[PDB]
Amino acid sequence: APGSQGAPGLQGAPGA
Amino acid sequence: GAPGAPGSQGAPGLQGAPGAPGSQGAPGLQGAPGAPGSQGAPGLQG
């Protein structure tokens, strides 16, 4: 898993 | 006694070389990965 840093998901996104 | 061997000679040995450490090895291991594209989340609600 390590390597995919930054925003591999929504993160800041409260939702969609 | 003129018989003798002042010029027997040859080419013994012929050393190849002392060292030559490395023509070329591993190109590399890439590194920081990448899934080319933007894995964004849905925009504002809607």
Side-chain angles (χ1 to χ4, degrees):
Chain A
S4 75
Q5 285 71 256
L10 79 170
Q11 303 213 14
Chain B
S8 177
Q9 313 304 271
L14 278 286
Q15 288 91 25
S23 69
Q24 190 65 257
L29 268 53
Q30 299 299 109
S38 56
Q39 187 273 324
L44 277 296
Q45 192 268 324

